[PDB]
Design an enzyme around this catalytic site. Structure first.
Site, mmCIF file in Angstrom:
data_model
loop_
_atom_site.group_PDB
_atom_site.id
_atom_site.type_symbol
_atom_site.label_atom_id
_atom_site.label_comp_id
_atom_site.label_asym_id
_atom_site.label_seq_id
_atom_site.Cartn_x
_atom_site.Cartn_y
_atom_site.Cartn_z
ATOM 1 N N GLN C 141 -18.917 85.040 -28.978
ATOM 2 C CA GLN C 141 -18.902 83.694 -29.548
ATOM 3 C C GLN C 141 -20.318 83.305 -29.961
ATOM 4 O OE1 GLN C 141 -19.104 79.398 -27.502
ATOM 5 N NE2 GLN C 141 -17.173 80.406 -26.977
ATOM 6 N N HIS C 143 -23.132 80.184 -31.593
ATOM 7 C CA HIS C 143 -23.499 78.833 -32.023
ATOM 8 C C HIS C 143 -23.843 78.825 -33.508
ATOM 9 C CE1 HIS C 143 -25.213 77.866 -27.713
ATOM 10 N NE2 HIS C 143 -23.895 77.754 -27.739
ATOM 11 N N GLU C 170 -19.126 77.925 -32.653
ATOM 12 C CA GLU C 170 -19.238 76.600 -32.061
ATOM 13 C C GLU C 170 -20.365 75.823 -32.729
ATOM 14 O OE1 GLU C 170 -20.516 76.742 -27.982
ATOM 15 O OE2 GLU C 170 -19.985 74.652 -27.647
ATOM 16 N N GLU C 221 -13.802 73.913 -26.137
ATOM 17 C CA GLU C 221 -14.305 74.652 -24.985
ATOM 18 C C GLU C 221 -15.096 73.793 -24.011
ATOM 19 O OE1 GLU C 221 -17.899 77.216 -25.737
ATOM 20 O OE2 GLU C 221 -16.678 78.695 -24.686
ATOM 21 N N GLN C 296 -15.497 78.628 -19.615
ATOM 22 C CA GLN C 296 -16.870 78.984 -19.947
ATOM 23 C C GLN C 296 -17.723 78.672 -18.724
ATOM 24 O OE1 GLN C 296 -19.952 78.266 -23.626
ATOM 25 N NE2 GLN C 296 -19.068 76.383 -22.735
ATOM 26 N N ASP C 335 -25.865 81.920 -23.380
ATOM 27 C CA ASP C 335 -25.821 81.006 -24.501
ATOM 28 C C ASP C 335 -26.925 79.973 -24.438
ATOM 29 O OD1 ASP C 335 -24.780 79.844 -22.189
ATOM 30 O OD2 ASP C 335 -23.005 79.019 -23.156
ATOM 31 N N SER C 362 -20.974 83.192 -24.652
ATOM 32 C CA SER C 362 -20.213 82.037 -25.120
ATOM 33 C C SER C 362 -21.105 81.133 -25.965
ATOM 34 C CB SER C 362 -19.616 81.289 -23.941
ATOM 35 O OG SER C 362 -20.631 80.808 -23.090
HETATM 36 C C1 LIG Z 1 -22.880 72.424 -24.016
HETATM 37 C C2 LIG Z 1 -21.620 71.791 -23.447
HETATM 38 O O1 LIG Z 1 -20.945 72.638 -22.502
HETATM 39 C C3 LIG Z 1 -20.628 71.881 -21.331
HETATM 40 N N1 LIG Z 1 -21.424 72.453 -20.225
HETATM 41 C C4 LIG Z 1 -22.501 73.259 -20.378
HETATM 42 N N2 LIG Z 1 -22.984 73.642 -19.168
HETATM 43 C C5 LIG Z 1 -22.208 73.069 -18.232
HETATM 44 C C6 LIG Z 1 -22.158 73.054 -16.757
HETATM 45 N N3 LIG Z 1 -23.059 73.762 -16.033
HETATM 46 N N4 LIG Z 1 -21.178 72.338 -16.164
HETATM 47 C C7 LIG Z 1 -20.273 71.635 -16.877
HETATM 48 N N5 LIG Z 1 -20.251 71.602 -18.217
HETATM 49 C C8 LIG Z 1 -21.179 72.289 -18.933
HETATM 50 C C9 LIG Z 1 -20.949 70.435 -21.619
HETATM 51 O O2 LIG Z 1 -19.738 69.835 -22.099
HETATM 52 C C10 LIG Z 1 -21.998 70.537 -22.686
HETATM 53 O O3 LIG Z 1 -21.961 69.403 -23.542
HETATM 54 CA CA LIG Z 2 -20.106 77.932 -26.038
#
Ligand SMILES: C[C@H]1O[C@@H](n2cnc3c(N)ncnc32)[C@H](O)[C@@H]1O
Ligand SMILES: [Ca+2]
Ligand code: B12
Ligand code: B12
Ligand SMILES: C[C@H]1O[C@@H](n2cnc3c(N)ncnc32)[C@H](O)[C@@H]1O
Ligand SMILES: [Ca+2]
Ligand SMILES: [Cl-]
Ligand SMILES: [Cl-]
Ligand SMILES: [Cl-]
Ligand SMILES: [Cl-]
Ligand SMILES: [Cl-]
Ligand SMILES: [Cl-]
Ligand SMILES: [K+]
Ligand SMILES: [K+]
Ligand SMILES: [K+]
Ligand SMILES: [K+]
Lengths: 178, 136, 551, 551, 136, 182
Positions: C141, C143, C170, C221, C296, C335, C362
């Site tokens: 995946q 960005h 994404e 996601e 993810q 990522d 991801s």
């Molecule tokens: C980049 C997107 O991915 C999600 N995101 C990224 N890292 C985490 C984490 N450790 N815990 C929860 N959500 C996360 C959030 O929604 C953020 O906005």
């Molecule tokens: Ca992602």
């Protein structure tokens, strides 16, 4: 000690922007994550608002240390519906009444990159939103090494900020020293 | 349905109807341009979601199938109302009475029985864990 | 007098990174914490009365959700009594089938499965991951973002990323109001580069669902869950709101996964004295309990937190392994920037790249990191050639391929022209020929003309306010000289009617062929079994630029 | 018009590396060549009559040596009859003991064991290597060289390297006549840094044996063998001359290993149309057949040859795995430059670093690579902080530790002063106080005063011509106020009397204690068994520079 | 000897003598300074190497043991003769007769029967594989 | 073959006078390859090595060697025939060694093991130093050239060039004295 409470913040009238600061701003922490004094940060945000002919009203928020929720309680009290939320470590958001709490008009999600010029421009833009103008968004600052350098420090500063949360306590209006 | 019936698009395209009884072959550029089909036509059905839940169970994924069963119920709920119910479940948004009313609406209007129980359960726990309106 | 040896070392990029000593009281410890609860479960009349030392009277919303929905209670006591060392042995043993493990792990508690994987070194964890990965074929995946939210550039970069092999892409926003433009550009460009690539636009949760309802994304996601109740609360959700959200996406025929990741609770100020890995296990079980097909994780955006402490990158692999072992699709991070050091970020990537996961990264950045609006990825566009070289060196399928400059120019140019036709057809602010040319040859937004951002975000929000849906984009392409892209866009919308790509690990490859863990089941049983890089795919990976023909 | 994306990628360091398309006819193919022989063995009257399809009448010296001495004929029919996939499965299965595998792998023909490991991916190979490694404890070896053959700098760099954790250290010469000085300087400095570190000086074979006879080395490693007869010949040896040399070292009580490595036969012009891995298997069996206890392999100095072609770095791990599976100590390279890319060289290193081998690197450069007289190592002194950080990130024992600048300055200064005393005592060209200071604080030879090289090599060769032995060094230390260093030098010489460190994987740790595969046998049996990084060694690895106390 | 007898320096130091019948505790710093011991004294014995060969056998390493047995014989050969014989085995250095004479001398002076056979084995194969003097 | 400048004039004989240095080139030098690994012409290399020998008052004699393409063994054939016992071996790809009769074949007096780093100035100094060894001096060794990226850039290329050089090996063929067209 440049911020003093002057009582519970009340609803605004329509030519104002509320700057809502976190519960440790100017108290247990007096600089942001890269050492810029809180006194200078507020000075420039207020001056940017007032440069646009709009009034600045500063409040401290207590129910959460999260800058989105700090700004939300500011935008519900703001006579324009526009608020600026600022955490001790420096993260800043321009918020608008009616948006979801974790939405916003503009977001500044890398506090280490903000300069006093950025903070003045954030106040300028908020005041233009209060006037129902469509200002050019403050240009995006993005540094791929900001998290590598500062995320652990950001987490530690935020852990300390979070100690000053008070459930159920409404915001308090602040007087800024001259 | 079994794993061998998956994917429907490649194995059984004719199993797939839309909420307005259109088929996959109905969605052509010509039919889009002539408005013979529109966005209202292009929505998955509860029958399709329940067929996929059957495939999920055959694949050993009972919880995924339960998600699909909740989704099947929610196909009957309009987009705006879906957003209203999601927002009402977020912290400090709702009174307990408002959550119970949403649950009653899910059950009595849309026959979304599983989703209604899910919301009633949230209501009870939001009292205990203090996530209702006024608890912040 | 300084040692010149130490002066040289002090200049090294790695010494700009953030390291901290362990801080138990605030959760600044990656795994194996003394405050972490001992595994336990008690069940009375089919209901959990105790979970990992905690009585039901003390349950928070996370305990309740996991105890009621996340653990197979019929075998939980039996599995709790099993030796956690033997279970970890089973995890990496090539001769214990994946299907023999899943009934055990789905009966474990969060502390139990953490105790199991904590007996493992990273070699054992990788050996287990290549078996527990749900989809047999690994994927990738990317960005696709830029600091201007420039839609012409997003379309071009997305076409290039799709052409290089990414099966999901994404975007997200510097200015939230731009989102509908970012999403449409990403979707159009992705379909130009390879029809079937799935696209998402990561926003606030209510905003992202509405954008998906209008047809401008393929999946979601960043549907975030969190491992303590006060952090979940500042995340503006509960397990019940996020579970309802999950079924809401499915009810619109939209693929979704949750996102979690070690260190979020430290970053957000309430770790409740627990290790990152224990709290992350709670997040993985929330995901399982909600019936969400995938997750993810691997710290993701909070990678600066576990990476600061001992065994943090091992913990990140461990949390990916827990995810796959619980029979969830794993989009395994890689990522997000955590280091100034190329050596250090490569070691962190290899933990997932070597065994393969459902999405090795991801969010590999398909733009240079200065344009990455997730604040930088662990890999970016300037690493593309290195990534292909390591695939070839190790005979590992990392999901990407070498590509020709002439092909990338042509596909970027077509994507920019297609989007120009969409904006013209929808009466959106024009994309000029100069912008099309710039997007064709750009490395990033430094190479793009400035757009009128104020006008763009006005028209972008009108897409929301007037409920302008994805068929407007199909029509604009069909009527603007791009009937081929119009058909591919319609085919992507038609995937939302079948439910096929709602299943674990689903992507759309080739000629609209859905490929998921259901029809591409991982059947790993040791050497010369399971997924092997070979055939035409191996020929593709071998053909890197610069290989001289020696004869 | 150029794509700026591709212009950026074309400047990447990795695109300066040498890559080639496979050239089967000349053996420019890493493994799995169509010309490689299929496994076979025919045994008549207890003697091999056919080996891998070749009748005894076609045997070259390598076939004869392997067939007569290198294959365990006692289990040969059983292992030849076993399926190669099952055998590869046994290699990585955590529950099939090393002791159960060794009688079978040592009974395999070269083509058989190549066929076995070629069924494996690198994750499986690492899973196997952590079990097949002969010594339970992993170790590490360093280069100590400089482009001036400056002996004062060698002593200081050697002391620092020993202090950082290297258990073996190796020098060589820009000017061959300098060798006795390089060797003495390396030995003195290593014993100052940590008594027990073994030292070698890599030279032409007859020269190196004589230098060891005089007592100025502890062991020898670069005792080279080759996989085709014409290449062995240009290497100036046969299997019989190298087997005699091996026994000659042992007859003087000196530890030794052979060196081989994929790609030497291509580099030296005669691959006989065979893959690098098959020819390297022949080298590993030559080593086994000679009765040599260990082997340095993993391409070593020819790493630009396998790395140029597909699956070359995987083949490098495969040849290490073959070595350990044949119950030989494996000093697993990671000692030679093959790439301009930090990402790429880290991926190559982790193959051995993650599971552990007897020497994870057989020549980490303890000097900056500009001073590395093996033409550069895969790691050098400027990587020391990254190496320690990755140990901490992954909880992997890579054999090294964080160290304090003040301690390194003090140990380098003591080494330089001790060598100054040796040179004064032995009447060698003086080491000035200025040179002692320079060596104390140097990063490399750019920081050292120029020496009179003509005078140095005159006196260095007099050490050979007058047979000045190691006891002269002991005496000079004792008479020049370094009684402690003299004792430690004497203790190293005493290890040549017992034969204990001649055994598989032997090093000398702590207080003169030999640690080898005989008394530290690897007993890996899955998670939570075998060697684990823990306790005080883990506390040592966690304590990297810059870890701030959070509260 | 068995692996339980290893390391000799710890389990059985008295099993180790040197070529001149010195023991390990004879090699003190003061004995080196006073020349009470010299480099001649500091040489491993065939007895030590044959003990280590038996340990190698017990550890399952028969080829290592055979190397140690050859090494035991070679302890009796002076340094410079070791070098001469090693060089004679390198490609194109020797005639077949010169190698056979080296073998016979190995036996007559030093009773190095295994090494002598090794050299004769090489000599025979060097004819077949053309590695004798004049074959280049 | 294009670029020819070396003519074999018969089997090289052993020199008797001590005031010569033999330059022994490999079997493909100046033939199938006419430049070294980084494109320096063989004619220019030989010109500079010869000039360095002669400017020290020593005679330069050039031979081609056939029995091995290995530069050490090429040099050894040269040092057997050199009246001073000093020789310089040069491979087509540029690798160079100063050798001396009596040393083991894979030993040497000076070695230049990274051909990509040699310049025409280095090659002249190699000739000077060889002649100074012939005069029984102990010259300052040519300064060490070492580039940790030389193998990454050139080892595969070096292997390919050497594979091609080895095709010109002729078993049993004694070295030929060369007439140099310079
Ligand atoms: C980049 C997107 O991915 C999600 N995101 C990224 N890292 C985490 C984490 N450790 N815990 C929860 N959500 C996360 C959030 O929604 C953020 O906005
Ligand atoms: Ca992602
Ligand atoms: C780390 C990060 C997070 C973390 C930590 C958030 C936290 N409150 O601690 C996690 C993963 C939990 C997260 C969640 C969300 N994030 Co976020 N996040 C980032 C990221 C990748 C890097 C920021 C960083 O490390 N800065 C360096 C440090 C040193 O500076 P800092 O000022 O201390 O950083 C703080 C802010 O970035 C803040 N923050 C992070 N995200 C968000 C979102 C909002 C709305 C606000 C007000 C603040 C905020 O958290 C950081 C630590 O305190 C940025 C990408 C970017 N372009 O910067 C996105 C980003 C800022 N996040 C974004 C979004 C959309 C969200 C969510 C709303 C998503 C969701 N699913 O709900 C939530 C909001 C939750 C919350 N209460 O803040 C968007 C914002 C888009 C916009 N223009 O409004 C961004 C740009 C990209 C993205 N899609 O992730 N985020
Ligand atoms: C690669 C290499 C080898 C390879 C390839 C040799 C070959 N003939 O193909 C291998 C591993 C097989 C090898 C073996 C030996 N090598 Co070597 N080798 C190197 C190394 C590490 C890098 C050279 C390189 O890649 N250069 C870049 C390429 C592009 O340039 P090039 O000119 O084409 O390189 C060629 C020469 O370097 C030549 N070469 C390599 N080693 C030796 C040794 C001698 C005596 C000669 C004449 C030539 C030679 O082979 C290379 C490929 O054709 C150097 C270290 C350094 N400082 O350069 C040592 C080095 C040159 N080798 C050395 C030695 C001692 C040897 C051996 C004598 C060791 C032994 N145990 O017998 C043998 C000689 C075998 C032989 N017939 O040449 C020493 C020389 C010390 C000195 N001052 O005399 C060095 C400096 C360091 C070392 N100990 O390894 N070597
Ligand atoms: C560095 C030293 O190690 C030995 N060496 C290095 N690489 C190899 C290889 N692939 N094969 C054989 N010997 C090698 C040579 O003896 C060289 O001189
Ligand atoms: Ca080495
Ligand atoms: Cl399930
Ligand atoms: Cl710590
Ligand atoms: Cl472990
Ligand atoms: Cl190829
Ligand atoms: Cl494979
Ligand atoms: Cl054996
Ligand atoms: K989201
Ligand atoms: K988490
Ligand atoms: K050697
Ligand atoms: K080899």
């Amino acid at each position: 000690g440049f911020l003093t409470e002057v009582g519970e913040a009340r609803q605004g009238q329509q030519d104002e922007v509320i700057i809502a600061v976190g519960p440790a701003f100017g108290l247990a922490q007096t600089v942001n994550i890269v050492g810029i004094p809180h006194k200078s940060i507020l000075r420039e945000v207020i001056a940017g608002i007032e440069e646009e002919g709009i009034k600045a009203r500063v409040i401290r928020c207590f129910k959460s240390s999260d800058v989105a929720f700090v700004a939300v309680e500011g935008n519900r009290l703001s006579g324009s519906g526009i608020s600026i939320g600022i955490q001790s470590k420096g993260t800043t958001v321009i918020h608008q009444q009616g948006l979801p709490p974790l939405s916003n008009l503009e977001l500044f999600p890398q506090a280490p990159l903000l300069t006093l010029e950025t903070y003045r421009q954030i106040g300028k833009n908020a005041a233009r939103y209060a006037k129902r103008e469509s200002p050019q968004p403050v240009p995006t600052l993005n540094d791929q090494m900001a998290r590598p350098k500062y995320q652990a420090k950001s987490a530690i500063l935020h852990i300390k900020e979070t100690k000053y949360v008070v459930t159920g306590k409404n915001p308090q209006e602040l007087r800024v020293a001259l | 349905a079994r794993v061998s019936d998956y994917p429907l698009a490649n194995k059984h395209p004719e199993w797939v109807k839309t909420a307005t009884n259109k088929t996959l072959d109905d969605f052509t550029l010509e039919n889009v341009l002539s408005n013979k089909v529109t966005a209202q036509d292009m929505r998955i059905t509860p029958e399709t979601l329940r067929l996929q839940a059957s495939i999920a169970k055959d694949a050993g994924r009972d919880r995924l199938a339960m998600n699909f069963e909740r989704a099947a119920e929610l196909t009957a709920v309009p987009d705006d109302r879906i957003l209203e119910i999601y927002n009402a479940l977020r912290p400090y948004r709702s009174t307990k009475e408002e959550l119970l009313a949403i649950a009653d609406d899910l059950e009595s209007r849309y026959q979304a029985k599983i989703c209604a129980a899910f919301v009633r359960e949230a209501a009870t726990l939001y009292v205990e864990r203090k996530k209702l309106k006024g608890d912040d | 007098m300084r040692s010149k040896r130490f002066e040289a070392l002090a200049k090294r990029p790695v010494n700009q990174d953030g390291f901290v000593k362990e801080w138990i009281e605030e959760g600044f410890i990656a795994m194996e914490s003394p405050n972490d609860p001992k595994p336990s479960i008690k069940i009375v009349n089919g209901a959990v009365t105790e979970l990992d030392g905690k009585p039901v009277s003390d349950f928070d919303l996370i305990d309740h959700f996991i105890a009621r929905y996340g653990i197979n209670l019929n075998r939980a006591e039996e599995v709790m009594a099993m030796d956690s060392v033997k279970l970890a042995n089973m995890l990496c043993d090539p001769n214990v089938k994946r299907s023999e493990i899943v009934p055990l792990t789905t009966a474990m508690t969060p502390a139990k499965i953490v105790e199991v994987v904590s007996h493992m070194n990273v070699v054992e964890m990788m050996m287990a991951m290549q078996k527990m990965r749900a989809r047999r074929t690994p994927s990738q995946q990317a960005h696709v973002t830029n600091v201007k939210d420039n839609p012409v550039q997003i379309a071009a970069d997305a076409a290039e990323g799709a052409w290089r092999g990414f099966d999901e892409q994404e975007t997200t926003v510097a200015v939230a109001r731009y989102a509908p433009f970012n999403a449409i550009a990403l979707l159009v460009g992705s379909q130009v580069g390879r029809p079937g690539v799935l696209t998402q636009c990561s926003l606030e949760e209510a905003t992202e669902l509405k954008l998906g309802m209008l047809g401008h994304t393929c999946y979601a996601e960043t549907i975030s869950v969190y491992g303590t109740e006060p952090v979940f609360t500042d995340g503006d959700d509960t397990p019940w709101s996020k579970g309802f959200l999950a079924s809401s996406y499915a009810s619109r025929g939209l693929k979704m996964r949750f996102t979690s990741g070690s260190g979020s609770e430290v970053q957000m100020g309430y770790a409740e004295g627990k290790s990152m890995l224990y709290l992350e296990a709670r997040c993985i079980y929330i995901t399982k309990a909600a019936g969400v097909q995938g997750l993810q994780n691997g710290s993701v955006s909070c990678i600066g937190v576990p990476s600061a402490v001992p065994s943090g990158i091992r913990a990140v692999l461990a949390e990916n392994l827990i995810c796959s072992s619980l029979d969830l699709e794993c989009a395994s991070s890689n990522d997000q920037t955590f280091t100034h050091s190329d050596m250090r970020r490569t070691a962190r990537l290899l933990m997932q790249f070597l065994p393969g996961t459902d999405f090795i990264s991801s969010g590999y950045s398909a733009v240079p990191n200065y344009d990455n609006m997730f604040a930088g990825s662990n890999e970016d566009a300037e690493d593309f050639d290195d990534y292909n070289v390591i695939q070839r060196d190790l005979k590992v399928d990392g999901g990407l391929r070498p590509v020709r400059e002439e092909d990338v120019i042509a596909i970027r140019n077509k994507a920019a022209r297609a989007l120009q036709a969409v904006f013209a057809g929808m009466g959106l602010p024009p994309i000029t020929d100069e912008e099309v040319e710039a997007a064709t040859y750009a490395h990033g937004s430094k190479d793009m003309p400035e757009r009128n951002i104020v006008e763009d975000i006005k028209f972008a929000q009108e897409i929301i306010n007037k409920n302008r849906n994805g068929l407007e984009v199909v029509k604009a392409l069909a009527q603007g000289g791009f009937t081929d892209v119009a058909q591919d866009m319609l085919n992507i919308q038609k995937a939302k009617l079948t439910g096929d790509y709602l299943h674990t690990s689903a992507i759309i490859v080739g000629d609209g062929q859905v490929l998921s863990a259901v029809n591409d089941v991982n059947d790993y049983a040791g050497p010369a079994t399971g997924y092997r890089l070979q055939g035409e795919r191996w020929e593709e990976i071998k053909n890197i630029p610069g290989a001289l023909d020696p004869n």
